[PDB]
Amino acid sequence: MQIFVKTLTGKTITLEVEPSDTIENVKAKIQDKEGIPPDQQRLIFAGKQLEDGRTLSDYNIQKESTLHLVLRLRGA
Amino acid sequence: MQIFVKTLTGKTITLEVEPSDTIENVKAKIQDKEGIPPDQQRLIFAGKQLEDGRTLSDYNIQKESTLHLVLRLRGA
Amino acid sequence: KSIEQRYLELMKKRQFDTFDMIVESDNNSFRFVVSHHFEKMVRLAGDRYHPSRVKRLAQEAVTLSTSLPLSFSSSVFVRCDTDRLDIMKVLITGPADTPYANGCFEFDVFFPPDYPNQPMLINLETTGRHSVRFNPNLYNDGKVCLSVLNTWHGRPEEKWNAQTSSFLQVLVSIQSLILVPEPYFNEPGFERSRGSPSGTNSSREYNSNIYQACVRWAMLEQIRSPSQCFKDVIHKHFWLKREEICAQIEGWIEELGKPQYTERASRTISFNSMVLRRHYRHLREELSKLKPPR
Amino acid sequence: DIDESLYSRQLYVLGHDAMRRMANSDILLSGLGGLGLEIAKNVILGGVKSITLHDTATCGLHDLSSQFYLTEADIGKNRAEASCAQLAELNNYVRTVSHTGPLTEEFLRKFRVVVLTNSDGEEQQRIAKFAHENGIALIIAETRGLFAKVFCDFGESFTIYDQDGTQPISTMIASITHDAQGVVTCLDETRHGFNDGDYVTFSEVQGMQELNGCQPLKITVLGPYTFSIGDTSKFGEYKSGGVATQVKMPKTISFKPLAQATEEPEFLISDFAKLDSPATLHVAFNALSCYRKAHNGALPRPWNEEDANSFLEVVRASSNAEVDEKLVLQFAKICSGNTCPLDAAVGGIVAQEVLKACSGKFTPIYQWLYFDALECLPTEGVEEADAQPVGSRYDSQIAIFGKKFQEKLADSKWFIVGAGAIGCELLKNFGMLGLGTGNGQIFVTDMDLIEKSNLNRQFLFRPHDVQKPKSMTAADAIKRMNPEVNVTAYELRVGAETEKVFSEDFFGKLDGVANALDNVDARIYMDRKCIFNRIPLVETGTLGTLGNVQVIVPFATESYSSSQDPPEKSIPICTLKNFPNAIEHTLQWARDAFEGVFKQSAENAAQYIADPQFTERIAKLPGIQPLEILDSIKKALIDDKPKSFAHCVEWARLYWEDQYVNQIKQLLFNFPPDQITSSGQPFWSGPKRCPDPLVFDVNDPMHLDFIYAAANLRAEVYGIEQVRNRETIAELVQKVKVPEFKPRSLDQDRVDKIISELLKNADKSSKITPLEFEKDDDSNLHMDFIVACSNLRAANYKIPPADRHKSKLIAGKIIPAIATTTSVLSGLAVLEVIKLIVGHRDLVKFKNGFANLALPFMAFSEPLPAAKNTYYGKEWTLWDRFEVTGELSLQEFLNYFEENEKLKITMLSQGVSMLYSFFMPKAKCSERLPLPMSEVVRRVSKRRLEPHERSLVFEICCNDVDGEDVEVPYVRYTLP
Ligand SMILES: *P(=O)(O)OC[C@H]1O[C@@H](n2cnc3c(N)ncnc32)[C@H](O)[C@@H]1O
């Protein structure tokens, strides 16, 4: 299936993913275009932070869903 | 090729570049070594201000050439 | 249609709108008809603005008109002044499976004249008159903590960047990294104490406090006295999810009723449970009075 | 000690040691021309022990071109004697005398530094030899038309204590390897900023305690975050902690004598596009003396070909090295003239070299400096007949630029924004240039008043001029210097609120704008005005020994707003609140506490007392604002109101306890001191310092100082008479009972209730008055309270305390400034102004200037051309705009653009307002469409349109015919 990801600047990118693809695979795919290394990325869907090892089917992410790319924060 | 960058406050920086790099690459290296974003950097060489999109060959910057990293001031 | 489908179809049209926050006054002055935290700073700024700010704000408005997150778990709503893009109010609903779930949190956003060089200013209004600290990053005075919001030395990939940072990024950062399922471990140093029984008890105590705090302020006060900008959004959100909210609060109650290992945490948990029952009774009273939106 | 109330800004540049050394140095200045006068003025403002003005020449008409202390009535008198009386008024701490006798060997022994101007070759050689043989610093300065020459000889062994003027940088240590090449790693990947080969010292190191307080060690920077300090195996293992601080190592250099240095010169490059200029200028300046000896002591005639050829032949005969013959001819053609801005710049440089010689601070020129401003001349040159003298005070200037340029100057109109140091220097230079003396005018504006600290670097003001407006006083001062100058002065602050006076008509007859401001908002506003009115703008800024000039030319260069400066560094919320680690954090926290306690807590109470109808006004406020105001009023007027000074002392004691004991105990309760994370590092490690609550001791000077300052300020807030007796306050504070503290883990009805309590219990006879923070007054106790608060919070976290000097520098946001930098940058800016007035348009002629007088360093660059963008194949820059005339409706405006420019407007804005947008409500869109644009602007901006407004500026975001966004120039809408 196809999914979108909105980057830091609001620029939307287009990706192709398996239902069983790990979020690590998705992170690598985003790096293949825009390059922030995966352990620095944070992927957002339905308000939950996705964890590296699960598949999109674990989160029930489905075709034409939009994801948000944010970064690991650091404390005040 | 190795070039030197002198800050207006008198600190000297050594960069490892090639006669074909681009000013954006030079500014990114300066960012790595110093921490100023590339858009806040003003490089002066031989009475010319280096602008993005050009290479060192156009400005004739050769080995052991010295650049100047200047800044504007808000007093008066 | 399923209730989630109805919620998604109904809240989509109202994600980004404009509201009359400022009206004309005597002797060529203006007054705020809504409570904005940064009114003093707006007046101090006056008419000063950087030339790039207008273009940056136009691009940000274009982005926000389509790009705001929207889901049955959490959503973000943005209101701006009808005549000034630099004055905004943000409503964020708590994500599910978190202590903030189905709670409406309101923020005030003001874009300084130096934007986008300086980061925008954001302040939390849903603090219960400064008597509640909802998160380690959300101080009770309203100040919001984010690394993205600071130009101090930090790290280049962590600072506020004039090009690679945006309002949407900040909103998603708040909505997904501050409203975490376990807010207790947000504080640095406490992050590595997780997995131990003491850390689990401390997190349970923090969540028990946040449960009643959110039930009181994020739901009951928002239903009783909603903000003028988010009145109908709040009404629709609370009417469409009243059963889920009641079930979630009941589950919170049952979880708080479980036995505890330590008396120090047990006393606080029992007190928070009694307070949460007291607030949940009032919330049930208020929910039944909600007239169904047209 | 040094009088800080006068030298406040200069101390932050020089230092106490340097100023003490200059206070024991005697200066002899030979030659009192324009350059000598500038040197004397800057040195006197510097504050040397004494200065002796020696001169043998008599005042003439040619001297009036740059000497602002000489009048036509002074013709025939000795220049030094005439100018000594006026020069003495600049600084009463400096003893100024005049000498007219010969410069004998015994007379020279009394001076630490000797400056020689207009001296002949033989006298120069003799005095240089004597000074070098007897250990006297010697500086030789000359100015010939648009050329300059500076020589420095500070002795056989000169010691510099601070080579660069920069503050030491301290970094915090994460790990140190224990081997023969021990590597220090910074904390959480933060750049140390240490230069290669630097010397550092260590403190607060646990385990490697031998490195604590050790002698400086040479380091090797292995990367942006790591460096090596040599063999560390002889010390113990590193546990944690440690701070490495840079140490400034003194340097000793040797200066060659003049007699030697002439044949092997070392040149300081002033312009890197003219690397071959100093070599030719050295020979030209050397051969000028020979030409004078060969022509009865007469310089070559202005713009004379025969004299230029003779000088070229003399240069050829005197030296065997190849020289730029064209440069030699150009030098010979204008060597007989003299101009003001060049003299000011060279005087500023030479005065910095005098201060360097006196104090031993900063690196001197090593050894020759040659400067020129040949770009100010017209491209085609000046005809000889045009450069002939006309018996006027500008004869030396006509010898350079000609009479036609003088006529152009007389008719020029220029606007100077800000009358500070840069503003005063620009005013003096413009007056001496003859600008606006004919049909032109010089406009100067400033909203501030004269303060005592301003007299150190602003030479146009006097101690009796305090509390007077800056602009009017400067205008009168420069009117006295040159009676022909026409000046109009305003007491207004430039901005949107003063457009009634600075309207479009006012900017329409201007020829340029010179900026002398100290903030970015005014600079941006003046740029927007200059862009809209299409007039050149010259921007100047200084910071200590640093300075820059930027020149903006319409349709030629980018604007000051096209590029961006580093943002003002703010402090993380958690670093100010809970975990400070530097004195800056504590100082900012103390400033915030002062504001919140003495100003914000009383504004609402004062407003309620002053305004009888305040309650009914605040009863209509939306949200919880009425409650948030009423409860603050009640707290300020009833709960915390002190009825006596004893109550003020009790409140101060309780505030001290709460700030330095209770909150720290709470913080330690939240985070135990011995808390350690799972991986091993303790929570109270690295950037977080473990605090410890203080114990109150009346015998401790810090605690008593804080109690005194806080109690006196609190009494001042409520109008209670202050008790400025330390013993009385100490006696009173010992009787205060401190309650025990333990750590912890209907709205309309309330409004009416608080209103009732206010009208019943609260008294309107009170005198609540919020305090405005003033740092320049030593009797208001503001700075004392700030210092006490910051130092107490520092002792809370074991942060090294800072004295009153550093606290005033940091908390007060004081910008260091010195007179030399101001003079240099003003001279450079006036040179750019002259270039603009000449009529130059090609960017090679113009030069942005950058300088740092500490290194010394000076550099120039061509201004960047305006960026070019295309829409529908049409090129446009930031200077281009659309022209819409008449009165049109909003719909007519959109249709005009859609039909003529083929652009669909999706967002129309006016300043910060938003007239039209794609996401606006449909009702408001329908309402605003038929209205005229002026009415729409009035409705949206919520303010009336003043009659002086003849046009409006609109910014539009457009979409082309294909539906993609395109950048387009702004729109100038002409009102009917
Ligand atoms: P330094 O601070 O010595 O000199 C700056 C002077 O400029 C004046 N000034 C600052 N900002 C403005 C505006 N907006 N309008 C007019 N004058 C201004 C300061 O008062 C200093 O005199």
Q: Specify the ligand 1 atom closest to the Cα of D492.
A: 16
DSSP D89-109: TT-TTSEEEEE-S---HHHHT
Which position among D84, D574, D789, D958 bears the catalytic label? D574
> D213: how many CB neighbours lie within 10 A of its CB?
10
Q: Specify the ligand 1 atom closest to the Cα of D525.
A: 14
| C5, burial (CB in 10 Å: exposed 0-12, middle 13-18, buried 19+) | exposed
The C-alpha atoms of residue D839 and residue D822 are separated, in whole angstroms, by 26
Q: Does D881-974 match D170-247 at the fold level? A: no
Any chains having at least 3 CB pairs less than 8 A from chain A are: C, D
Residues facing D414 on adjacent strands: D442, D512
Give the distance from residue D283's alpha carbon to the nearest chain B alpha carbon, in angstroms.
24
Residue D522 beta carbon below 6 angstroms from any ligand 1 atom? yes
Residue D445 beta carbon below 6 angstroms from any ligand 1 atom? yes
In angstroms, what is the span from residue D446 Cα to ligand 1's centroid?
Answer: 6
Give the number of beta-carbon pairs within 8 Å between A and C: 83
Q: How many CA atoms lie within 13 A of D578 on its CB side?
A: 18
Tokens standing for residue C43: 């007046």
The dihedral region occupied by D623, where left means phi > 0, alpha psi between -120 and 50, and beta the remainder, is left
Tokens 């539906």, residue?
Answer: D963
Residues facing D441 on adjacent strands: D413
In angstroms, what is the span from residue D473 Cα to ligand 1's centroid?
Answer: 15
In angstroms, what is the span from residue D9 Cα to ligand 1's centroid?
Answer: 16
For domain D170-247, give the CATH superfamily: Ubiquitin-activating enzyme E1, FCCH domain (2.40.30.180)
**Direct distance between the N- and C-terminal alpha carbons of chain D, in angstroms, rounded to an integer:** 66
The C-alpha atoms of residue D483 and residue D814 are separated, in whole angstroms, by 36
DSSP D621-641: -STTHHHHHHHHHHIIIIIS-
The C-alpha atoms of residue D374 and residue D337 are separated, in whole angstroms, by 13
Grouping H, G, I as helix, E, B as strand and the rest as coil, residue D486 is coil
Q: What is the resolution of this structure in A?
A: 3.1
The C-alpha atoms of residue D579 and residue D572 are separated, in whole angstroms, by 10
Contact D570, D766 (CB under 8 A): no
The C-alpha atoms of residue D805 and residue D783 are separated, in whole angstroms, by 10
Chain centre to alpha carbon of residue D212: 38
For D796-847, what is the HEC assignment? Answer: HCCCCCCCHHHHHHHHCCCCCECHHHHHHHHHHHHHHHHHHHHCCCCCCCCC
Minimal Cα distance from C138: which residue of A? A76
> D874: how many CB neighbours lie within 10 A of its CB?
11
Q: Specify the ligand 1 atom closest to the Cα of D494.
A: 15
Interchain pair A73, C148: CB under 8 A: yes
Second-level CATH architecture of C3-288: Roll (3.10)
Interchain pair D907, C24: CB under 8 A: no
- How determined? cryo-EM
- Residue numbers in A near D573 (CB within 8 A): 76
Tokens standing for residue D715: 């009494």
- Residue numbers in B near C153 (CB within 8 A): 35
The C-alpha atoms of residue C36 and residue C38 are separated, in whole angstroms, by 6
The dihedral region occupied by D738, where left means phi > 0, alpha psi between -120 and 50, and beta the remainder, is beta
Label the pairing between strands D512-515 and D537-543.
parallel
* D581-798 fold: Arc Repressor Mutant, subunit A (1.10.10)
Nearest to B35 among C156, C161, C162 (CB): C156
∠B51-B53-B58 over CA atoms, to 5°? 75
Q: How many CA atoms lie within 13 A of D71 on its CB side?
A: 9
For domain D4-160+254-275+338-375, give the CATH superfamily: NAD(P)-binding Rossmann-like Domain (3.40.50.720)
In angstroms, what is the span from residue B3 Cα to ligand 1's centroid?
Answer: 41
Nearest to B31 among C156, C162, C163 (CB): C156
In angstroms, what is the span from residue D423 Cα to ligand 1's centroid?
Answer: 9
In angstroms, what is the span from residue D555 Cα to ligand 1's centroid?
Answer: 28
**Among candidate residues C81, C100, C80, C82, the one with its CA nearest the CA of residue C90:** C80
Could you state, in order of their start, the residue ranges of all structural domains in chain C? Answer: 3-288
Tokens standing for residue D421: 């140091």
Give the distance from residue D743's alpha carbon to the nearest chain A alpha carbon, in angstroms.
23
Give the distance from residue A76's alpha carbon to the nearest chain D alpha carbon, in angstroms.
5
Q: Specify the ligand 1 atom closest to the Cα of D815.
A: 2
Could you state, in order of their start, the residue ranges of all structural domains in chain D? Answer: 4-160+254-275+338-375, 170-247, 411-567+815-851, 581-798, 881-974
Give the distance from residue A75's alpha carbon to the nearest chain D alpha carbon, in angstroms.
8
Chain centre to alpha carbon of residue D88: 27
Please name the residues between 528 and 587 in chain D that touch chain A, using a CB distance below 8 Å. 572-575
- Residue numbers in A near C177 (CB within 8 A): 42, 49, 70, 73
**Direct distance between the N- and C-terminal alpha carbons of chain C, in angstroms, rounded to an integer:** 17
Strand spans (E) along chain B: 2-7, 12-16, 42-45, 48-49, 66-70
Contact D176, D182 (CB under 8 A): yes
- Residue numbers in D near B51 (CB within 8 A): 864
The C-alpha atoms of residue B60 and residue B63 are separated, in whole angstroms, by 10
For chain C, what is the HEC assignment? Answer: CCHHHHHHHHHHCCCEEEECCEEECCCCCEEECCCCCCHHHHHHHCCCCCHHHHHHHHHHHHHHHHHCCECCCCEEEEEEECCCCCEEEEEEEECCCCCCECCEEEEEEECCCCCCCCCCEEEECCCCCCCCCCECCECCCCEECCHHHCCCCCCCCCCCCCCCCCHHHHHHHHHHHHCCCCHHHHCCCHHHHCCCHHHHHHHHHHHHHHHHHHHHHHHHHHHHCCCCCCHHHHHHHHHHCHHHHHHHHHHHHHHHCCCCCCHHHHHHHHHHHHHHHHHHHHHHHHHHCCCCCC
Q: Which top CATH class is D881-974?
A: alpha beta
For D677-716, what is the HEC assignment? Answer: CCCCCECCCCCCCCCCCCCCCCCCHHHHHHHHHHHHHHHH
Tokens standing for residue D460: 């146009």
**Residue D59 among the catalytic residues:** no
The C-alpha atoms of residue D302 and residue D384 are separated, in whole angstroms, by 7
The dihedral region occupied by D668, where left means phi > 0, alpha psi between -120 and 50, and beta the remainder, is alpha
Grouping H, G, I as helix, E, B as strand and the rest as coil, residue D601 is helix
Minimal Cα distance from C164: which residue of B? B37
The C-alpha atoms of residue D382 and residue D397 are separated, in whole angstroms, by 12
Grouping H, G, I as helix, E, B as strand and the rest as coil, residue D353 is helix
Q: Specify the ligand 1 atom closest to the Cα of D454.
A: 3
Pocket test for ligand 1, best of D8, D417, D445, D528 (most atoms within 8 A of CB): D417
Residue D493 beta carbon below 6 angstroms from any ligand 1 atom? yes
| D639, burial (CB in 10 Å: exposed 0-12, middle 13-18, buried 19+) | exposed
Q: Specify the residue with its C-alpha closest to ligand 1, atom 11.
A: D517
Could you state, in order of their start, the residue ranges of all structural domains in chain A? Answer: 1-76
Q: Please state whether the peptide bond connecting residue C116 to the residue before it is cis, i.e. omega within 30 degrees of 0.
A: yes
Grouping H, G, I as helix, E, B as strand and the rest as coil, residue D607 is helix
Nearest to D860 among B8, B10, B47 (CB): B47
Helix (H) or strand (E) holding D15: none
∠C110-C116-C121 over CA atoms, to 5°? 25
For domain D411-567+815-851, give the CATH superfamily: NAD(P)-binding Rossmann-like Domain (3.40.50.720)
Contact D837, D147 (CB under 8 A): no
The C-alpha atoms of residue D577 and residue A42 are separated, in whole angstroms, by 28
